[PDB]
C-alpha cells in the first residue's frame, strides 16, 4: 500500500499530473503512521503545486479585474470566486490533515517545525485570498511557534528554518504590511546564515544557497 502509493506519486510527479498525486499523498498520509523524509517532501511539493497553480491563476484573474463595465467586471468575479472556492477546498483538506494527523504525530523537532511552517504557509494563502483577521492571526501564531521551536535544535543554516524565515517576512510584508520587521527578520536570518556557513552537508548544499539567494532578493527589493 505505502510503497504502491509513493510509486503512484513518483509516476504522477514526472507527468505534471498533480491532482492525482495530491489525492494519493493524502491517502498515504491518512494511514496514521509517521512520514519519513522521502514521502515528507513529496507530500509537501504535491500540495505546493496544487495550491500554487490555483493561486497563480487567481492572481491573473484578479489582475484582469484590476485592469477593468457591469458584465466584463462580473464575469471575472464569478471565475475569481470559483477559483477561490476550489483553493479554499484544497487548502482546507491539508490544514485539517495536519491538525488531525500530522502535527500530533510529529515525533522529530525538524518534522514539527516543517509541518508548522506548512500550516502557517497555507493560512498565509488563505489570508491573501481573504472574519478575515482570524486567518492572518492564526498564520502568525503558526509562524511564531515554528520559529520559536526552530530556534533551538537544527543548525542555523538549515533549509526549513531559512524558508520559514523567508515565508514569515513575506507574511509581514504582503499581509500585515510590516516591511521594517520583514527586512529585519530576513536580514538577521541571512547574516546568521553567513556566520554559520561553515563546511556544510552536501545534501543541503544546493538548496540552502538557493533559499539564501531569494532571501537576498527580498532584502534588495525591500531596501527601496
Amino acid at each position: 500500500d505505502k510503497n504502491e502509493l509513493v510509486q503512484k506519486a513518483k509516476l504522477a510527479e514526472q507527468a505534471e499530473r498533480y491532482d492525482d498525486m495530491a489525492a494519493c499523498m493524502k491517502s498515504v498520509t491518512e494511514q496514521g503512521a509517521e512520514l519519513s523524509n522521502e514521502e515528507r517532501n513529496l507530500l509537501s511539493v504535491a500540495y505546493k503545486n496544487v495550491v500554487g497553480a490555483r493561486r497563480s491563476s487567481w492572481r491573473v484573474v484578479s489582475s484582469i479585474e484590476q485592469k477593468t463595465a457591469e458584465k466584463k467586471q462580473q464575469m471575472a468575479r464569478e471565475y475569481r470566486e470559483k477559483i477561490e472556492t476550489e483553493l479554499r477546498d484544497i487548502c482546507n483538506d491539508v490544514l485539517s490533515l495536519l491538525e488531525k494527523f500530522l502535527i500530533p504525530n510529529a515525533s522529530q523537532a525538524e518534522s514539527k517545525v516543517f509541518y508548522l511552517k506548512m500550516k502557517g504557509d497555507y493560512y498565509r494563502y488563505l489570508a491573501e485570498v481573504a472574519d478575515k483577521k482570524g486567518i492572518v492571526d492564526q498564520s502568525q501564531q503558526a509562524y511564531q511557534e515554528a520559529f520559536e521551536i526552530s530556534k533551538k535544535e537544527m543548525q542555523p543554516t538549515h533549509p526549513i528554518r531559512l524558508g520559514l524565515a523567508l515565508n514569515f517576512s513575506v507574511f509581514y510584508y504582503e499581509i500585515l504590511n510590516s516591511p521594517e520587521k520583514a527586512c529585519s527578520l530576513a536580514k538577521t536570518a541571512f547574516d546568521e546564515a553567513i556566520a554559520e556557513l561553515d563546511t556544510l552537508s552536501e545534501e543541503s548544499y544546493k538548496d540552502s544557497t538557493l533559499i539564501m539567494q531569494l532571501l537576498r532578493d527580498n532584502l534588495t527589493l525591500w531596501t527601496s
Binding site: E13, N41, V45, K48, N49, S56, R59, V60, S63, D121, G163, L166, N167, V170, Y173, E174, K206, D207, L210, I211, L214, L215, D217, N218, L221, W222
Partner: peptide, 15 residues
C-alpha cells in the same frame, strides 16, 4: 509577470 508580481517565496525542490 502578474504571476510573479509579488516578492519571492519558498520554491519547490530539486526534482
Amino acid at each position: 509577470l502578474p504571476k510573479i508580481h509579488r516578492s519571492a517565496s519558498e520554491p519547490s525542490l530539486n526534482r
